């Protein structure tokens, strides 16, 4: 729950 | 020194405004940046704020015992780890912890992409 | 993906070899890695091994009371940050550390770029 795009 | 001295100028700015009126860091952070806060992760400047704002304290004031920074690779981000001080509600008796945060460059400033925090028993 | 879980079995190797031989804990920094063990700064393996075999003790043992990690952007790289006891020589009494480590991936494994290290004092 430590998300990048 | 020069990281040291980089990492110091804008830590004091970060805990001069946390210290006055930590509701108001949002500008610190970033839709990216990470707080980890005595296991509690959030991200984004939001929910780090709100969790900061959530802190079960009136007054608050950080005293920093030792500062220790480093390039965080070659490209200008910096890395500092640091050991202090929280004085909370006028108390005399300071509560230690531990904090590092990785700090990206935004102008003549930074913003904070990775904040760890962890109380430190004395 | 799992950084946490990375950062337990990185953390615990290195300690693990470092509490046991330190002389060889050399594979696990590179030229450009940095080390900032309390006022001493040194950069590469040569440099970085060097200081630690120094280290006066004939026996050390690490115990690690907290870790954290988060990812240190988005390429893979991580941030752990770590506090605990020091138990030196026959010393019953433990010195507080904190430490950081940088983690870059080194294609299938990691290896350290930074190395912040901090006995702290009551």
């Known amino acids: 729950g430590f998300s990048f795009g | ?122």
């Open chain 2, 1 to 122: 020194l020069d990281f040291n001295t980089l990492a110091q100028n804008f830590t004091q700015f970060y805990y001069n405004q946390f210290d006055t009126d930590r509701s108001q860091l949002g500008n610190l952070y970033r839709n990216e940046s990470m707080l980890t806060f005595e296991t509690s992760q959030l991200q984004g400047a939001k929910d780090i704020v709100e969790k900061l704002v959530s802190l079960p304290f009136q007054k608050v004031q950080h005293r920093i015992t030792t500062l220790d920074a480093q390039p965080a690779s070659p490209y200008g981000d910096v890395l500092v780890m640091i050991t202090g001080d929280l004085l909370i509600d006028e108390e005399q008796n300071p509560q230690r912890f531990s904090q590092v945060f990785h700090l990206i460059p935004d102008g003549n400033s930074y913003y904070v992409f990775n904040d760890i925090f962890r109380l430190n028993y004395s």
